[PDB]
From Swiss-Prot, chain A:
It is found in: Cytoplasm. This is Large ribosomal subunit protein eL8A. Present with 238000 molecules/cell in log phase SD medium. There are 2 genes for eL8 in yeast. It comes from the Eukaryota. Belongs to the eukaryotic ribosomal protein eL8 family. Component of the ribosome, a large ribonucleoprotein complex responsible for the synthesis of proteins in the cell. The small ribosomal subunit (SSU) binds messenger RNAs (mRNAs) and translates the encoded message by selecting cognate aminoacyl-transfer RNA (tRNA) molecules. The large subunit (LSU) contains the ribosomal catalytic site termed the peptidyl transferase center (PTC), which catalyzes the formation of peptide bonds, thereby polymerizing the amino acids delivered by tRNAs into a polypeptide chain. Component of the large ribosomal subunit (LSU). Mature yeast ribosomes consist of a small (40S) and a large (60S) subunit. The 40S small subunit contains 1 molecule of ribosomal RNA (18S rRNA) and 33 different proteins (encoded by 57 genes). The large 60S subunit contains 3 rRNA molecules (25S, 5.8S and 5S rRNA) and 46 different proteins (encoded by 81 genes).
Swiss-Prot record, chain B:
GO terms for biological process: exonucleolytic trimming to generate mature 5'-end of 5.8S rRNA from tricistronic rRNA transcript (SSU-rRNA, 5.8S rRNA, LSU-rRNA); maturation of LSU-rRNA from tricistronic rRNA transcript (SSU-rRNA, 5.8S rRNA, LSU-rRNA); ribosomal large subunit biogenesis. It comes from the Eukaryota. Its main location: nucleus. Involved in the biogenesis of the 60S ribosomal subunit. May act as a specificity factor that binds precursor rRNAs and tethers the enzymes that carry out the early 5' to 3' exonucleolytic reactions that generate the mature rRNAs. GO terms for cellular component: cytosolic large ribosomal subunit; nucleolus; preribosome, large subunit precursor. Keywords: Acetylation, Nucleus, Phosphoprotein, Ribosome biogenesis, RNA-binding. This is Ribosome biogenesis protein RLP7. The chain holds residues 55 to 322 of 322 of the full protein. It is found in: Nucleus, Nucleolus. GO terms for molecular function: mRNA binding; RNA binding; rRNA primary transcript binding; structural constituent of ribosome. The keyword Acetylation applies. The modification Phosphoserine is found at residue 203. Present with 7720 molecules/cell in log phase SD medium.
Swiss-Prot record, chain D:
An adapter protein that specifically links the 26S proteasome to its substrate CDC4 which is one of the substrate recognition subunits of the SCF E3 ubiquitin ligase complex. Required for turnover of cell cycle regulatory proteins CDC4 and GRR1. Required for synthesis and nuclear export of 60S ribosomal subunits. Required for vegetative growth. The keyword Nucleus applies. Present with 45900 molecules/cell in log phase SD medium. Its main location: nucleus. The chain holds residues 31 to 339 of 376 of the full protein. It is found in: Nucleus, Nucleolus. It comes from Saccharomyces cerevisiae (strain ATCC 204508 / S288c). GO terms for cellular component: nucleolus; preribosome, large subunit precursor; proteasome complex. This is Proteasome-interacting protein CIC1. GO terms for molecular function: identical protein binding; large ribosomal subunit rRNA binding; proteasome binding; protein-macromolecule adaptor activity; ribosomal large subunit binding; RNA binding; rRNA binding.
Swiss-Prot record, chain E:
The keyword Protein biosynthesis does not apply. Present with 4280 molecules/cell in log phase SD medium. The keyword RNA-binding applies. This is Ribosome biogenesis protein 15. The chain holds residues 88 to 220 of 220 of the full protein. GO terms for molecular function: ribosomal large subunit binding; RNA binding; rRNA binding. One of its GO terms (cellular component) is cytoplasm. It is found in: Cytoplasm; Nucleus, Nucleolus. It comes from Saccharomyces cerevisiae (strain ATCC 204508 / S288c). Involved in the biogenesis of the 60S ribosomal subunit. Required for pre-rRNA processing and cytokinesis. Associates with the precursors of the 25S and 5.8S rRNAs. Disruption phenotype: Essential gene. Abrupt growth arrest prior to substantial depletion of ribosomal subunits. Fails to synthesize the 25S and 5.8S rRNA components of the 60S ribosomal subunit, and exonucleolytic 5' processing of 5.8S rRNA is strongly inhibited. Arrests at cytokinesis and fails to assemble a contractile actin ring at the bud neck. GO terms for biological process: maturation of LSU-rRNA from tricistronic rRNA transcript (SSU-rRNA, 5.8S rRNA, LSU-rRNA); ribosomal large subunit biogenesis; rRNA processing. Residues 4-82 form the RRM domain. Keywords: Cytoplasm, Nucleus, Ribonucleoprotein, Ribosome biogenesis, RNA-binding, rRNA processing.
Length: 51, 247, 282, 268, 133
RNA sequence: CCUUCUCAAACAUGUUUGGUAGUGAGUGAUACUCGAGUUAACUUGAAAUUGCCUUAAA
């Protein structure tokens, strides 16, 4: 949610809704960065999961 | 505030601990009756774990042995059941980082089976015993001019002579000999001595100390295991290395 | 700071690698700067010996660690083993505070104090950080001094220890000193004498004194873990049956013989008699 | 034990009963043995371990050969120790069971039950597709919590304990011999806490009436010595029972170390 | 409208009467906490009811725990309408079995089973079953 | 926001014996022994509206 400039992700919820993809807005690009071994991350995605 | 996940986790872990104690108690009752058609195993096993770790499972010979027992923190989210708490209180191990000496016999073995996941059990060498007594030795002493006794370090051989002279214990060296050889008045000397208050292997919450805590928890998880099998062997570890780290 | 960052981010393996890839300071250049002369180092190691023998008898606490205590114990054992093997002790005095030793090291007299093996209480009123800084400096200095002394005597430093011997009794007997006539009368004292030390007698003190003034020691306390005996060192009010060929003496005979230099007669030291006063050699 | 002509006539009549002219056309052809006992087989304690009865004729091999024309084919599941799962493979069983045609379709361990099949729906979907489940006797005591309670409501999904270790080490030879012995000679039967025992003999299309008679006679002869049974019947789905045995005289049976350890560890 | 009664469902295994009371006492005083259990075995049916002294406290508990994810269970909390008291929710324990008395004598029970055998013979004769005895 | 009895002994790689008490709800037919104990098999997202010890510490 804390992405500056906000235009980078301001279209993402509408795109996810139109494509029928479940999305969630979360607090912390730093939290997503810890998820992906970076300082910050604007987005994260799960595509393939184990059984 | 208290969270429902913590409540449910504690309930489930306590239920599993109660079930384990129930099965151990049933097996020990049937073994004591010793006329039971149905049973899993009918003897005692000691699993020595040493150092990439090697494990040796042996039949308990039955000859009385000497053990050192250290009270460690138990399984996560487990409230200690009444029987285990009673055995720990009778052994004077109600708090962690505390150690005592134990005379291992066939009657002692089921108690260790009951209190397995809260203690670490080892065979103390003579050097470790001497280090423990001559480094951390305390007694409850009531002076002639003092109404209420207070705990002091075992500094006087005269106090030992006046408290255990009828049995024939003169000095701290005599106490060490009695504890090591498990002779007569072994219980008298053992309970004359207070339980030993060790110190934590890792203390502090800086970055280095938290890394040491993570390594210690990894090593303890690798070494000690919670069998929950009601016929599990008693785990015996390198108490010399443990006491070197804790003393 | 970087380790804190890795732990906060949850990179445990990265934190472990950071901890492995670190270098710590050493005090060897400071030692060589402050003591350009080995005689100066020998003249100054007395305070180092006192501090190390004090810290080797402390229990482990939150401020003082088992690693530091064990290192102090190791270096004290190495010093005691060197002194006992080279047979250099000259004066001994058992005061109520502890045992004072004076030994002739490299033509200089070194006096230090060894406390008894009892649980001394920590006052919680002292500056342990300052004392541990002094202890680190003293440990470095005495490591340098012990290395030089072992090399000049033609011995391997650091000496190895026997594991089962250390498991039996953890003293100076653990470290065996390997290579690659002494001065009479103190070094030659107690030669061809085997002392059966009783249990109540302080084994570390008696063994160090006898081995420095060479003799054989048989410890009664060593038989717990599991002939040539001329003397038996005992201290008890009433003693049981005695070997006819064995002379039964009290521990003060050893101290008085060492302080006199000449062999004091053993008649004046019996388990059921009064003892002569233990005078200070100084 | 059982009169030969009597049991042959009973088998012939019951196999005639099916061919008079969903699951209706398929379930009514399975033969069942009923054992009525004076007392409970197990006692006052529940049992999940299936008793094994040895017969002359193979049973699962006709099941495999007749499963070719069924919606749910015959399958075998093997459960081994987590520490011994790496010591075997599908080829390590194929090279030893290619002569006998015994195929082990799936080999798992306890880790798979704990992680992959933890969910109830996934666990049911995985378990329900197997017809013969075998497990190592070491891990077989933890299976009531791993496989769940639904897997013990049928004899085919209930695990069978087999001896896999010889000289206290994983012996592939002993494992293969026990697998072959279970597949060829022995059949399971669940001992209940009641007095009625149901034995699934198989399907009429699988085997001939002579083989059925031989197998049921051997089963009766083995189970007569096991307990003090009272009555024996043979039935099929949607059909009544036929008696085959009757005995009378068996009916007349109807009418502190813990504190010592505490004392030893206590001072007073 | 709304009462002070809360219906909870999709409970995990460890959630029982005492656990529910301990958790929701933080939200408010509880008049009665009950949990549906199986009659023959002491196992929960994973749903229960609670009663609050304050209906506003019950509404707060509902809007706080309505879709809480707990150990893979998405808990469901509803406010029961005005009235509709909770009733007939017994705390069953694990039932045990024991052999009862057998008052029929040996002769009578043997006669009863012989008559049952004769009845089976008559049934086989009736159903067109050609078998001996 | 925890994580599940991972086996023993007897005899000569083999034979015998002991060791295994489960998520819930529902459908169902069919027989057996005294409201009890047993009995073919089908469904389901982990499904659900009421059977009277404290250094895993701040």
């Amino acid at each position: 949610n804390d992405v500056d400039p906000i235009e980078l992700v301001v279209f993402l919820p509408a795109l996810c809704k139109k494509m029928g993809v479940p999305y969630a807005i979360v607090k912390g690009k730093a939290r997503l960065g810890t998820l992906v071994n970076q300082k910050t991350s604007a987005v994260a995605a799960l595509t393939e999961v184990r059984a | 505030f208290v969270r429902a996940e913590s409540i449910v986790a504690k309930t489930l872990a306590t239920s599993r601990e109660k079930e384990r104690i129930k099965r151990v108690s049933i097996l020990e009752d049937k073994k004591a009756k010793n006329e039971t058609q149905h049973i899993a195993s009918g003897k005692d096993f000691i699993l020595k774990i040493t150092e990439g770790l090697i494990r040796e499972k042996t039949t308990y010979d039955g000859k009385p042995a000497l053990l050192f027992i250290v009270r460690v923190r138990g399984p996560l989210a487990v409230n200690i059941p009444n029987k285990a708490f009673k055995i720990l209180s009778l052994l004077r191990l109600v708090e962690t980082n505390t150690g005592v000496f134990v005379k291992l016999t066939k009657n002692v073995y089921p108690l260790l089976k009951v209190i397995a996941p809260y203690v670490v059990i080892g065979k103390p060498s003579l050097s470790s015993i001497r280090s423990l007594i001559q480094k951390r030795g305390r007694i409850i002493y009531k002076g002639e001019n003092e109404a209420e006794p207070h705990e002091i370090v075992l500094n006087d051989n005269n106090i030992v002579e006046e408290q255990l002279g009828d049995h024939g214990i003169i000095c701290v060296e005599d106490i060490i000999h009695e504890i090591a050889t498990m002779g007569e008045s072994f219980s008298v000397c053992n309970f004359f001595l207070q339980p030993f208050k060790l110190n934590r292997e890792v203390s502090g919450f800086g970055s280095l100390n938290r890394l040491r805590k993570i390594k210690q928890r990894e090593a303890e998880s690798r070494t000690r295991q919670f069998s929950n099998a009601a016929t599990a062997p008693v785990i015996e570890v390198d108490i010399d290395s443990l006491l070197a780290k804790l003393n | 700071r970087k380790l804190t960052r890795a732990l906060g981010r949850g990179e445990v393996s990265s934190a472990k690698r950071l901890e492995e890839n670190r270098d710590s300071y050493t005090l060897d250049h400071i030692i060589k700067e402050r003591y350009p002369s080995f005689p100066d180092a020998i003249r100054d190691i007395d305070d180092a010996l006192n501090m190390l023998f004090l810290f080797s008898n402390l229990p482990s606490t939150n401020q003082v660690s088992s690693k530091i205590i064990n290192d102090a114990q190791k270096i004290c054992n190495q010093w005691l083993a060197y002194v006992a093997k080279e047979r250099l002790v000259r004066k001994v005095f058992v005061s109520i505070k502890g045992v004072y030793y004076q030994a002739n090291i490299k033509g200089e007299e070194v006096r230090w104090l060894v406390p008894f093996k009892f649980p001394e209480n920590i006052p919680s009123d002292v500056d342990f950080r300052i004392m541990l800084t002094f202890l680190e400096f003293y440990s470095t200095l005495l490591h340098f001094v012990l290395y030089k002394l072992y090399t000049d005597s033609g011995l391997i430093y650091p000496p190895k220890l026997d594991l089962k011997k250390d498991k039996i009794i953890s003293g100076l007997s653990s470290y065996i000193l390997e290579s690659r006539k002494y001065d009479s009368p103190v070094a030659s004292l107690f030669s061809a004498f085997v002392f059966y030390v009783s249990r109540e007698v302080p084994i570390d003190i008696l063994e160090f004194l006898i081995l420095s003034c060479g003799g054989n020691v048989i410890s009664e306390a060593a038989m717990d873990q599991i002939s040539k005996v001329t003397h038996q060192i005992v201290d008890r009010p009433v003693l049981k049956n005695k070997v006819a060929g064995r002379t039964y003496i009290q521990p003060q005979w050893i101290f008085d013989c060492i302080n006199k230099g000449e062999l004091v007669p053993a008649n004046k030291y019996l388990p059921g008699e009064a003892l002569p006063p233990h005078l200070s050699p100084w | 034990a059982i009169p030969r002509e009597r049991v042959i006539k009973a088998v012939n009549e019951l196999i005639k009963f099916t061919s008079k002219p969903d699951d209706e056309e398929e379930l009514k052809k399975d033969l069942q043995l009923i054992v009525v006992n004076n007392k409970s087989f197990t006692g006052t304690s529940k049992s999940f371990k299936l008793k094994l009865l040895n017969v002359k004729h193979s049973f699962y091999k006709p099941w495999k050969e007749a499963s070719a024309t069924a919606v749910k084919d015959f399958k075998v599941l093997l459960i081994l120790k987590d520490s011994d799962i790496k010591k075997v493979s599908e080829d390590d069983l194929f090279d030893q069971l290619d002569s006998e045609g015994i195929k082990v379709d799936e080999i798992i361990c306890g880790k798979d039950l704990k992680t992959v099949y933890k969910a109830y729906e996934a666990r049911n979907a995985f378990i329900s597709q197997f017809s013969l489940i075998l497990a190592d006797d070491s891990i077989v005591t933890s299976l009531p919590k791993l496989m769940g309670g639904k897997a013990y409501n049928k004899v085919e999904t209930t695990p069978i304990s087999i001896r896999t270790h010889a000289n206290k080490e994983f012996s592939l030879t002993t494992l293969t011999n026990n697998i072959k012995k279970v597949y060829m000679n022995q059949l399971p039967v669940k001992l209940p806490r009641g007095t009625t025992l149901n034995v699934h003999l198989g399907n009429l299309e699988w085997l001939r009436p002579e083989e059925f008679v031989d197998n049921v006679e051997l089963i009766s002869e083995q189970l007569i010595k096991a307990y003090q049974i009272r009555s024996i019947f043979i039935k099929t789905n949607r059909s009544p029972v036929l008696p085959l045995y009757y005995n009378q005289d068996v009916l007349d049976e109807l009418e502190s170390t813990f504190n010592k350890g505490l004392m030893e560890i206590a001072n007073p | 409208e709304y009462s002070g009664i809360i219906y909870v469902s999709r409970l995990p295994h460890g959630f029982h009467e005492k656990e529910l009371s301990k958790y929701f006492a933080q939200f408010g005083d509880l008049k009665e906490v009950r949990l549906a259990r199986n009659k023959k075995t002491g196992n929960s049916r994973h749903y229960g009811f609670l009663e609050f002294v304050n209906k506003e406290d019950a509404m707060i508990a509902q809007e706080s725990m309505n879709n809480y994810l707990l150990m893979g269970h998405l808990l469901q909390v509803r406010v029961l309408p005005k009235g509709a008291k909770i009733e007939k929710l017994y705390k069953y324990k694990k039932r045990v079995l024991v052999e009862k008395g057998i008052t029929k004598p040996v002769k009578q029970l043997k006669d009863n089973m012989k008559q049952k055998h004769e009845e089976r013979i008559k049934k086989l004769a009736k159903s067109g079953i050609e078998f001996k005895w």
